Subunit: 126 residues, 4 copies
């Protein structure tokens, strides 16, 4: 039912070599796994998110976001990343994102809790 449900669902790769496997639901849900090529991370991590299942009709992208907490059956980095961005369809579909990575900190170190960055995902590895 989602306008971009079929386009979003599948396997995506970012510029770092990370792998993002996602199913878009008709209700706006995103569910899948994330494997990071960098950082204190090994194997797949659960991800969950949301996307706009009825986007604008003027050629705009489709807003979405998702979260990974960096704990799985191998490691725990005591941190979580959220990606905020939009899906852009067409011949070379892309999910363009900016992200925030927060680590658990003491109060004294809270000022340095959060990294910001940007990831671009494609359906073919770069």
């Amino acid at each position: 039912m989602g306008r971009d449900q079929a386009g979003i669902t599948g396997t995506w790769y970012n510029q770092l070599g990370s792998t993002f496997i996602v199913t878009a639901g008709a209700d706006g849900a995103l569910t899948g796994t994330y494997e990071s090529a960098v950082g204190n991370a090994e194997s797949r991590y659960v991800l969950t998110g949301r996307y706009d299942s009825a986007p604008a009709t003027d050629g705009s992208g489709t807003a979405l976001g998702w979260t990974v907490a960096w704990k799985n059956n191998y490691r725990n980095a005591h941190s979580a990343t959220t990606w905020s961005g939009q899906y852009v369809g067409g011949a070379e579909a892309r999910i363009n994102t900016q992200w925030l990575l927060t680590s658990g900190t003491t109060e004294a170190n809270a000022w340095k809790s959060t990294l910001v960055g940007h990831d671009t995902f494609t359906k073919v590895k770069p």
Copy 2:
């Protein structure tokens, strides 16, 4: 059972008057609803996220994040916010966050697609 499952589960209010109702699952899931006091938003929106269910024991906070897409059965703002932050428990429990709000845009307007801000959530209004 997640270490902070009981502390996170419940209702949170930010500095703007928005309301965040969340259930923390034993496996690290966050599920619930968000009601925003500002912006193109009315009634409740679905939220989903994750939290660290086995955090450090050194006094550090508990890392977490969640997403809301601003579409429900009443409105659609063609946008989505992600909050990234940490839960700090105790008498004056807090969830301290930074957030990214992306709107769907044309490619030419993508440079102005994403707002950044910070929200602090407490257990009282």
Copy 3:
């Protein structure tokens, strides 16, 4: 002269205990020194920036920003912070900011080069 030249010029303090000493010029310049209470920083660092010297008259704040490179005669942290925000006048004047701290990194580590945060500066603290 700048509309908020006199209001911005002076000594400001943020929530961490850092001190921001600034002169606003009639031409939109910001020039001064920054002393950070946290991080790889000791004593004062040069700052430079810009502000809107003819802001809106509808009660809106005054947009501004400035940079500190964390090198002085005593230390070098191989990093730089930019604060982006707005000055809000009145009995309880504030400069509300969000900031980006970038450290020099190898290309392999570029994904972790930049912190984001927020500081609120007041004239009393």
Copy 4:
């Protein structure tokens, strides 16, 4: 002189087609002009900033940042952008940045005051 004073100094273009003309001083200063290809912007705006004039020698980039207030003799957008990033010298020199654009707002609209994005600058015009 700064290690990268000669390398940073010059004319740069980002992926939007904006033009960044900058002079790096031996004292860590950045001065120059910015012309944006997008937004409420016309002609050149004053910029000022700072860079690390004695960076690490381990292959790391050179940290820097600069500000533009979007007021000149032609327009006033009641806004300011700060770019935070690092200069990477060598083959295909690049300045990689993330930026924050804050507009003056009323207190009720302060939550919507700030955009975030990322710009990459090279000396080759797109």
